[PDB]
Amino acid sequence: PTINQLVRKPRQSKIKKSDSPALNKGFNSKKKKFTDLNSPQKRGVCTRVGTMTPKKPNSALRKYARVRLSNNIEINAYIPGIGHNLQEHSVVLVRGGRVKDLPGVRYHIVRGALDTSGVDGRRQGRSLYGTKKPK
Amino acid sequence: ANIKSAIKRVKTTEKAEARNISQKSAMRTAVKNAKTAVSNNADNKNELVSLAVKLVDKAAQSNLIHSNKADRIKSQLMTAN
Amino acid sequence: AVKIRLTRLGSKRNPFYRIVVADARSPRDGRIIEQIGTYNPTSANAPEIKVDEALALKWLNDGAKPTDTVHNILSKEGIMKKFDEQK
Amino acid sequence: NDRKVYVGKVVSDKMDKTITVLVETYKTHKLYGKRVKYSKKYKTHDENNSAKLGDIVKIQETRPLSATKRFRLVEIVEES
RNA sequence: AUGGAGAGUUUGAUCCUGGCUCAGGAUGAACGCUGGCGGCGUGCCUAAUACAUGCAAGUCGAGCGAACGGACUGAUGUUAGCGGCGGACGGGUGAGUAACACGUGGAUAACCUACCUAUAAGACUGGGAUAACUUCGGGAAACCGGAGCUAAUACCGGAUAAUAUUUUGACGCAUGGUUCAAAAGUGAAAGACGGCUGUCACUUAUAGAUGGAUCCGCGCUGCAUUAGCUAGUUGGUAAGGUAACGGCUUACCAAGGCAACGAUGCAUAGCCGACCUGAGAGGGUGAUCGGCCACACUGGAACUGAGACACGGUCCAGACUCCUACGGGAGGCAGCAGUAGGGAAUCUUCCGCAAUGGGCGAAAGCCUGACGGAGCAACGCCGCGUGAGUGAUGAAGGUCUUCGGAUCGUAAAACUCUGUUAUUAGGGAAGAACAUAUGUGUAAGUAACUGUGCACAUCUUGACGGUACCUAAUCAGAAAGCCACGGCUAACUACGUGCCAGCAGCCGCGGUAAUACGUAGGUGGCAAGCGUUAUCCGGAAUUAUUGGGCGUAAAGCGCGCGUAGGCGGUUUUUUAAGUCUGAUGUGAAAGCCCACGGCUCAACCGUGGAGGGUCAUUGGAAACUGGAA
Prior knowledge:
It is classed as ribosome. This is part of a larger assembly, with chains A (about 140 residues), B (about 80 residues), C (about 90 residues) and D (about 80 residues). Chain C has about 90 residues and is α+β, with helices and mostly antiparallel strands. Chain C has three helices and five strands, in the order E-E-E-E-H-E-H-H. Chain C has helices at about 55-60, 70-75, 80-85, and strands at about 1-10, 15-25, 35-40, 50, 65. In chain C, strand 1 (about 1-10) and strand 2 (about 15-25) form a beta hairpin. The radius of gyration of chain C is 13 Å and the shape is flat. Chain D has one domain. Chain D has strands at about 5-15, 20-30, 35-45, 55-65, 70-75. A five-stranded mixed beta barrel of chain D has the order 1-2-3-5-4. In chain D, strand 2 and strand 3 (about 35-45) form a beta hairpin. Chains in contact: A-D.
């Protein structure tokens, strides 16, 4: 635009909508209010453990878990790895990162953490997927 | 709480309050009497005014009122006189 | 009141001091009025000291009161001597 | 010392011993650099209210008079 | 000149447009796997949630009365108290606050200021009490109330005293100013010394310094699907009171005042120096350090005081928690540790006043969870390690194999070699300058002396800490892991599975011959760290001022008339608001950059510059923009 049009109407940049919104909100049990926190991870309770069919191009039974976080927020989280020991009423640690196939899963359950075991036979890539150094 | 210095400071505060309020009460009585005598031009206006100026400056020395407040009262009294 | 004192400017076990005119109520490493000089007590052998003369004698005449060791520092430059000469 | 002086235009004389002086000045834009005209209204004291709406007058600051006025009328130069 | 990199992805194929994603740098980070050391830092970002328990503000017996108590008349203590000063500092937190709160620049001829400094004038004369103590009562504590005594630098009354107030004459609007010549009325202390005086208590005036207070220009979040806001509101006149101006408050007048240049309202937020990112312009942020502000369980109020409407002060209300003989009482960690709770997440219920700073004191000293140090945590930055020289890129063993070999690989034994580290066994800093005391002179003032200021040299002391650090022996021994290897993007093979199990940032892979899944070898990237997640800038010219566009990709209002605003033909004269060029003042310090110096280097530290403003005042220029003719 012209300089005068810019002076009257300064340029407005676009706002950035962030992924993993449920990690950006805290809770205050005393005031019954939601806060803004920007947490790396959040801890929740598994209210449902099951398996989800993936998007159309792919075909594989993917394990997931419905997790109610520390907030009053109920999200769906992926379970990386082969074997998992999670049933209902399991405390998990949930990080960011979505699954492309699974529609409605925007988070990942951290393996090898509070009440979540690692992958039994993992030998290369043990930082991810939990599990300690064999021998 | 109750630090030893604080517990004593309460006793010396009421002690100073009792002495202070008696003195300004006497001052304010004199000031009211002085300006009411000036208004009707009584025969005793002059020493009542002098009694008020005396008590006003005595309290301003005791930090009961500020010095600048004493002049406003004093200036008011002698101007009407 | 106004005090001529030392402000710590050193790291762990390596203190450096500035000779500063500051109010007594101010924090040690906080608000100041004027910087006068420096004091390094950990230099090679003798503690190297640097003091200005015009401002130091200006604040002393204005009623600034040196602390115990600023007195020593001002004495090693004869500042307290010349302050005494002008009675 | 010196108290600041402004020259503006009388835009209100509906109050006694008080006029409103419009001191228009210029402020550049931080980003684009264009100078934009902006105006500021000053409430000034004048015991003898000889200023009438439309006069350019001389204004100098002073101690607080009333809740808003901080200026006095120094010189009236226009007629309108 | 010191500074600017792209790539993948729409199609049968292409060029555009356009979005998405990745490669970089960061954090008070958390999580996963690992983990040797040191030095500098950093460490509840959430519940301004609730707090068990310890400490965080006392000092002066040279101000003075003790039942004082008591060496030996009684040194010394403060048992306890009156009195003075301090408790308004220091420390903590960011709830509230969109405001002259904060930054910057000014103004106050509308202002207060204890201690500190200097100059003067002084410090006269009397009086009555009361703490403490004794003895009676109450009350469950907390405490409270009677009598009888006693001091003070405690309190009160007179004397005298200013530039204090009233009336008098001799500028920048409210004026300021210092002479005059009258009136009223305003003080004080003693203590410990020496031969009358010294010191440090005092009182009154001045100034200075310091610390506060108020006002103003400019700057400083989002929302217009928040458009009309206010009625002490806005101005005036009186009065009051405030350190001080002022609707600050109250009466009476008038109807005023602000607002598309965003009144008001709503939501959010402590502000700044500064930090991160970027080539820059900019964008994001407001941990630690420093300046300002506000707050102290929530909410009102005042007292004392120079200064508070007061974190470890008072009164009241409220919500909690505790005691009670039920009438009544006590409490406030957003001080340092620490506990419970919330959370992904953030530490010892430590040592010392040895240094610096602060309070009080003549000082010795006392207090100081300020501070100086230790404890824990790879949380970060920096530095050093975990071995080296020769030695067959052949043992034996894995993995492939074209079965010939190849690769791990000079890697290993193998000999020599070192001790950074580690162990033990001896030395062992700096930080220390003092204050006081002691002597010695000098200066001022002294009748003189004591005493004070100054000059010198003596004596003293360290938490850290037997800790840095050094020196001897001894051993390669006790010291590496993490992630990747399809392309972006450095690193490929075999086996297992067979659109399953699973991987994935995107393109996507996996359906019996996956360099994309799991494992094994090898490789590569880093390394006491390596990856993942969370958030910001970049790349993004993807808000384009620098630096984009609107024929068909998104975008010209259906078209006029027009108001504010924005812009505006040629010449001359003038002005100087912009513009340009100087000079002053300031833009604190700490930060960034440059240089230099000290830690064995570095991190780090310290010095000196530089830089930083729509800044203020004041000259100069007059082409352009602006004003006037």
